[PDB]
Amino acid sequence: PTHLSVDTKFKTEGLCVDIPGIPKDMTYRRLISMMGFKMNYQVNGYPNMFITREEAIRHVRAWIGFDVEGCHGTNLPLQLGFSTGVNLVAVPTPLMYKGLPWNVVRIKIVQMLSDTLKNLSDRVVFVLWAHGFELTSMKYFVKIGPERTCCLCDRRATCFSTASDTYACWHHSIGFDYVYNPFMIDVQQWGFTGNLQSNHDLYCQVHGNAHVASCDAIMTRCLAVHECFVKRVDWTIEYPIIGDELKINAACRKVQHMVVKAALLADKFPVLHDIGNPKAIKCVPQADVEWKFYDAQPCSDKAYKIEELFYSYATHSDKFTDGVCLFWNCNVDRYPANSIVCRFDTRVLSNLNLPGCDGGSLYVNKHAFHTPAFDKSAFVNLKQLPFFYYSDSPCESHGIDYVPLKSATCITRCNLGGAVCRHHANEYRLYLDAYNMMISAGFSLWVYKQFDTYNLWNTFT
């Protein structure tokens, strides 16, 4: 069982208000036929328009919530809402657009999906809370057939043009009018009691219901993300490389060793309390410090209460007041004052970060991590960690042309002694690039208020 069988049953109770008299017994095969799509027995890579919950999770970057509200059935106009906040009105003659015929509506749909998805996925997954009109309207903007490649490149075809009779991916679809071979999934098939708003509002206070189709489309994708990434967590699923994943991850490792090593040199803490990843390793292996590890998986729902991390039942818990605490991506409600902290800012706009549930976001870099909403108050006992570069390594070149470096934040023997050497200038600039890579990727660094880089200069005496 790799794909969803067309002979699987589709619960139709949710479709009987827009479609009165629909059979209770219904397969995907009969539903697709009813929707106007002739699969004509095809073994060419597109076995079903609808996908499994598992296939949907592997393709989370393609998720676009879709809702159609029957505004006034090729007799009345339809309001087409997308989780992008777009509302289009199709006529059969929070961004809201006036009534227009399908021939122009379908052009806008291709433009919008292509701009949204080109840098995220090779496909679209229409996430629905199906009531009837969204499925019966797909024949107006969707064409299906064998799997294909773009006319201008080797990527999988996601759009079709009736004007030129050619196929294109999301990058080369300008002027294309049909969505080609889309995927879709009905959230109602997962067995819910009650309507969309009641199920959504159980877990999210951030998306309201302004009664437009995009509002439902957003709430639908939000509820799907909650079910698949907040309540259900699968860290085994790997996701393709689409951006700066390898550079961002390497930068995080360089930044972590740098910041922790400098803190241990500047304030000579005897013990370090490392909380978070149960698979974490000593980021500064040569440090003198007593390195103690505490297991806490990434919290995907709400941030950990600092108090519950010490709830040791009938035994005494450790005193974190001695030494320093390292919370590298361990999201707590209020950090202790003696901490070094890396906290992902969920508000960041990027191709790695997808909108999440209740203010949080779904960070997808090798794995999907739903992260709780960023909260500035978690850092009240700390300060924003300033940029600095520290190096005790020898001033030795080993060899890109050179411009002399002048910086107050290059903490080296050469800078103390008057002039930065070529090696430390190359290393400072590389470290500044990795630092900016990680900050721009959404990460934020915080440190105990007594942290001072002035204390680092005397480690050369």
Which of ligand O2A, Zn ion, none does 260 bind, CB closer than 5 to 8 A by kind?
A: none
Tell me how far, at minimum, the Cβ of 273 lies from ligand O2A, in Å. 7
Is residue 49 within 8 Å of residue 61, measured between CB atoms?
Answer: no
Binding to Zn ion (CB under 5 A) within 393-422 occurs at 395, 412, 414, 421
Tell me how far, at minimum, the Cβ of 206 lies from Zn ion, in Å. 5
Residue 235 or 310: which CB sits closer to ligand O2A? 310
Angle, CA of 105, 125 and 248, to the nearest 5°: 115
| Annotation marks residue 227 as catalytic | no
Among 102, 176, 239, 294, binds ligand O2A (CB under 6 A): 294
Give the pair of three-digit tokens for residue 44: 């060419």
- Contact status: 311 vs ligand O2A (CB under 6 A): yes
Q: What burial class does residue 29 get, using C-beta atoms within 10 Å of its C-beta: 0-12 exposed, 13-18 middle, 19+ buried? A: middle
SS3 328: strand
- Contact status: 172 vs Zn ion (CB under 5 A): yes
Is residue 451 within 8 Å of residue 383, measured between CB atoms?
Answer: yes
Angle, CA of 358, 299 and 191, to the nearest 5°: 60
* 436 DSSP β-pair partners: none
Chain centroid to Cα 103, Å, comes to 33
Residue 153 or 174: which CB sits closer to Zn ion? 153
308 is in an annotated binding site: no
Residue 269 or 294: which CB sits closer to ligand O2A? 294
Tell me how far, at minimum, the Cβ of 204 lies from Zn ion, in Å. 3
- Contact status: 221 vs Zn ion (CB under 5 A): no
- Contact status: 312 vs ligand O2A (CB under 6 A): yes
Is residue 391 within 8 Å of residue 405, measured between CB atoms?
Answer: no
Which of Zn ion, ligand O2A, none does 204 bind, CB closer than 5 to 8 A by kind?
A: Zn ion
Residues in the chain: 461
Token pair 């997308």 in the structure block, residue: 82
Selecting among 18, 177, 186, 216, the annotated active-site residue is 216
Between CA 256 and CA 438 the distance in angstroms is 11
Which of ligand O2A, Zn ion, none does 395 bind, CB closer than 5 to 8 A by kind?
A: Zn ion
Between CA 233 and CA 301 the distance in angstroms is 10
| Annotation marks residue 69 as catalytic | yes
Q: What burial class does residue 213 get, using C-beta atoms within 10 Å of its C-beta: 0-12 exposed, 13-18 middle, 19+ buried? A: buried
- Contact status: 309 vs ligand O2A (CB under 6 A): yes
Among 106, 123, 273, 424, binds Zn ion (CB under 5 A): 424
Q: How many CB atoms lie within 10 A of CB 373?
A: 17
Who contacts 298 (Cβ-Cβ below 8 Å, separation ≥6)?
A: 276, 277, 329, 330, 331, 369, 371
Tell me how far, at minimum, the Cβ of 292 lies from ligand O2A, in Å. 9
Between CA 458 and CA 455 the distance in angstroms is 6
Query: Which residues line the annotated binding site for Zn(2+)?
Result: 150, 153, 169, 172, 200, 204, 207, 222, 395, 414, 421, 424
Q: Which residues are known to be catalytic? A: 67, 69, 134, 211, 216
Positions touching ligand O2A (CB under 6 A) are: 294, 309-312, 315, 317-318
Query: Which residues line the annotated binding site?
Result: 67, 69, 134, 150, 153, 169, 172, 200, 204, 207, 211, 216, 222, 274-280, 395, 414, 421, 424
Positions touching Zn ion (CB under 5 A) are: 150, 152-153, 155, 169, 171-172, 204, 207, 222, 395, 412, 414, 421, 424
